[PDB]
Curated annotation (Swiss-Prot), chains A, B:
Gene: TYMS
Catalytic activity field: dUMP + (6R)-5,10-methylene-5,6,7,8-tetrahydrofolate = 7,8-dihydrofolate + dTMP
Cellular compartment(s): Nucleus; Cytoplasm; Mitochondrion; Mitochondrion matrix
Transmembrane segments: none
Organismal lineage: Eukaryota, Metazoa, Chordata, Craniata, Vertebrata
Class of the enzyme per the UniProt entry, highest EC level: transferase
Listed name of the protein: Thymidylate synthase
Amino acid sequence: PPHGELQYLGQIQHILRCGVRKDDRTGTGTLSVFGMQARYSLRDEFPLLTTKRVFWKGVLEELLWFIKGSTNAKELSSKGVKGDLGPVYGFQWRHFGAEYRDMESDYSGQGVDQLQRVIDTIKTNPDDRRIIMCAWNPRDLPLMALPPCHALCQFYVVNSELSCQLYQRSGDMGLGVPFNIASYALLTYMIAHITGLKPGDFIHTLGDAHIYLNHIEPLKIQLQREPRPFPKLRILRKVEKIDDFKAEDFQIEGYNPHPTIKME
Amino acid sequence: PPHGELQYLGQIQHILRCGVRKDDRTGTGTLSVFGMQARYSLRDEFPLLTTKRVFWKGVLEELLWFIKGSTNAKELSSKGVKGDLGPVYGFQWRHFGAEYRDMESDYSGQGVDQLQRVIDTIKTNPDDRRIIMCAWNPRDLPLMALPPCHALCQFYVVNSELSCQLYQRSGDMGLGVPFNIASYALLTYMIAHITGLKPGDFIHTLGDAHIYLNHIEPLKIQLQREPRPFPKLRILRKVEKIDDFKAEDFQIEGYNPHPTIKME
């Protein structure tokens, strides 16, 4: 009617032609172009890509683990999904601001719950702009005092529609980008459900978008494939508290993608 | 060859048709669409708009005042440009992190200089991504603990080219947007000059981009105008320390715009 994945596939085509090779931190090289925007409509649909299969469970899983605010991977890895680890996403969202030691020390009564606030601001003053929500890459926290956020998701409501816009500092188009999309979208699909709203749009802004050398060919192949009609997620239940969203409370329907694509 | 202002004018046309009216904090109403991207090339040119006149001096002025890290408006207003004020931009960049009281109390030996760092990271590890640089709207600092950044400018280098991408939380397309462009671009035009680089691209990402009701008509008129060839800024001198950039060290040339447009 248009198509959205087209957006993805499009930039991809762009990356591969006239993107410049550049080597990152690990040392591995990539092709990357600075700055990219994509808008995926979340209205009566779900941007869970079709020109390749996406680990939906892998998404919904991990997501619920962050919202549940746990720093223990086993809390997520205990569902076939990939001595502790550290302050990942499932802590920088809820128990942020309070000194962390381990995972079995209930911070219930600690932290500056970044997520709730958002959920609340939508309930209080939707006409606001500063509905932002930062997040960080653990590897940088002590790496340097006053460490810059890896991402952030400004929210936006109007005409009863919630629409998130994600801005990542760096982008791994290969297997990263496809993931986050359905991820944050899912999140957005949940917030609005508990904030009496209706899903609007997803916008994915990026800083250093890149492709990894050992990823080109498969993607070259991935291009030939043709996007199919997007899914449609259904939250099979009524909730009001973000922390009760149980795993089996979502049902993807209308999802028939092209074969997987093992990327490194 | 394309044209860049076209980008501006384009989104504008978009805002006006099928943008939704929405009232902000002041209470005044506007038309706004969530999410927008524009890329202005800074190569042998300067994105200082032509389908209306821009207060270049007003830009260069204020800019030098932030880089100079002063919280005293008189330090800038003392050049015909618009008991103290507070932590504006000329402090959140340099003396950030240290308790502020007034303006005549030299913090020279205080603060977590956000700008220098960037200038330095370009000198140290350009292949990096986290070249970000936050900033805030003073009105929110005590307004709420853990206040979200109003903006941020991730930097990016490659093939000897520095290219900034500015992401603002909210956007005033009317008279705001045109300003910042030449602003941050100018900044970028200076950083690369002291970091042995060459200007690349400007990308202007936005969250809530809007138009003010009492701005429509003039803009409607502003559209009819046709973009002229962009300027070309010349830094008439060689420097290496960002704090010596004197006012009269820039020379805009090739700037012949359409008449001004007093906007509210």
